[PDB]
Amino acid sequence: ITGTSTVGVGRGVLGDQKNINTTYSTYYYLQDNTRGNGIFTYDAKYRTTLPGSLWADADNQFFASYDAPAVDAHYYAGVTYDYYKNVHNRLSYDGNNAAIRSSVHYSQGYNNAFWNGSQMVYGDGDGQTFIPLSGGIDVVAHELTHAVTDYTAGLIYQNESGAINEAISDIFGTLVEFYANKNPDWEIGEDVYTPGISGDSLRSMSDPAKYGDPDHYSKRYTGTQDNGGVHINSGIINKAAYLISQGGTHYGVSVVGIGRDKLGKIFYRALTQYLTPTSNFSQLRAAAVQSATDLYGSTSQEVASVKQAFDAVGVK
Ligand SMILES: [Ca+2]
Numbered sequence: 001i002t003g004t005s006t007v008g009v010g011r012g013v014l015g016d017q018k019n020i021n022t023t024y025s026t027y028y029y030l031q032d033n034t035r036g037n038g039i040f041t042y043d044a045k046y047r048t049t050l051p052g053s054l055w056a057d058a059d060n061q062f063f064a065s066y067d068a069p070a071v072d073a074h075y076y077a078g079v080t081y082d083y084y085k086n087v088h089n090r091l092s093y094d095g096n097n098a099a100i101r102s103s104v105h106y107s108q109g110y111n112n113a114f115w116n117g118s119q120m121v122y123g124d125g126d127g128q129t130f131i132p133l134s135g136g137i138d139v140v141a142h143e144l145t146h147a148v149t150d151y152t153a154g155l156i157y158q159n160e161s162g163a164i165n166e167a168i169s170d171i172f173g174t175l176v177e178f179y180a181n182k183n184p185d186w187e188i189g190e191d192v193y194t195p196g197i198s199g200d201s202l203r204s205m206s207d208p209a210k211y212g213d214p215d216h217y218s219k220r221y222t223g224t225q226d227n228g229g230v231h232i233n234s235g236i237i238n239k240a241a242y243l244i245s246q247g248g249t250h251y252g253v254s255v256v257g258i259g260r261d262k263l264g265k266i267f268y269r270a271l272t273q274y275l276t277p278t279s280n281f282s283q284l285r286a287a288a289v290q291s292a293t294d295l296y297g298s299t300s301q302e303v304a305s306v307k308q309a310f311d312a313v314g315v316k
Pocket residue numbers: 057058059060061062063
């Protein structure tokens with residue numbers, strides 16, 4: 001909508017106060033004009049028609065319970081925008097400042113969030129398995145990273161290309177979580193998963209097996225479920241990414257860690273210059289070795305570390 005840029009204030013899903021960029025025209029809308037061609041947040045009003053209505057508020061204060069998921073979808077989309085722009089010089093998901101649209105309150109008791117090819121969609125959870133999923137910065141950034149992948153490598157969402165797609169989203173989800181630097185970890189979705197159980201999460205990158213996901217290629221899932229295990233076999237690549245950043249000895253293979261920033265630069269370059277829609281895990285290894293070579297040189301610690309990490313998860 002046409003109006004003037006304003007700054008609202010409210011509380012997110014975990015009860016934290018934050019400022020949000022809004023737009024005023026009779027109502028205050030969740031429309032942030034300060035980033036690209038805008039960030040826009042919508043109310044799906046517990047139904048599944050999308051996007052719903054652009055979020056409108058009478059006084060620019062967003063402290064109602066109903067407001068909380070919108071506050072966080074909107075704010076965390078901005079954080080994710082800032083990460084890609086500042087860290088990778090990428091302007092929005094298409095690289096040309098496409099408008100970022102999100103809908104909250106999707107359906108009833110919906111225990112998921114997703115990128116639908118055009119926009120972000122967040123359920124509220126059923127209050128047992130999940131609370132509203134935009135409360136999780138890693139979840140927001142995971143999903144927005146799907147848009148980045150769709151516009152770049154275009155990894156097909158099934159079998160190994162699909163598991164890479166998923167791991168890419170968990171990797172940048174986590175790097176965005178560290179960027180924001182509020183309780184960062186290598187787990188996924190811990191802020192919104194199972195409110196009555198502390199200490200758990202949906203997936204772990206540091207030890208995927210904690211939740212029964214494979215952490216070596218020899219344990220890959222090869223059935224038909226979950227698009228051929230895209231959220232399962234992602235653990236093999238997640239573990240590799242973890243090891244590249246943090247180091248460790250895994251099934252007796254030692255990896256020298258090189259830290260999060262180099263992890264991000266190597267995987268961003270692989271994603272944007274080397275991976276293709278049908279890439280498999282071995283091709284991912286090749287893409288990551290070549291990206292590290294480009295960035296740090298053939299004889300670098302960084303290239304050897306990428307090799308060690310893929311060796312450790314059994315991907316040659
Ligand atoms: Ca209000």
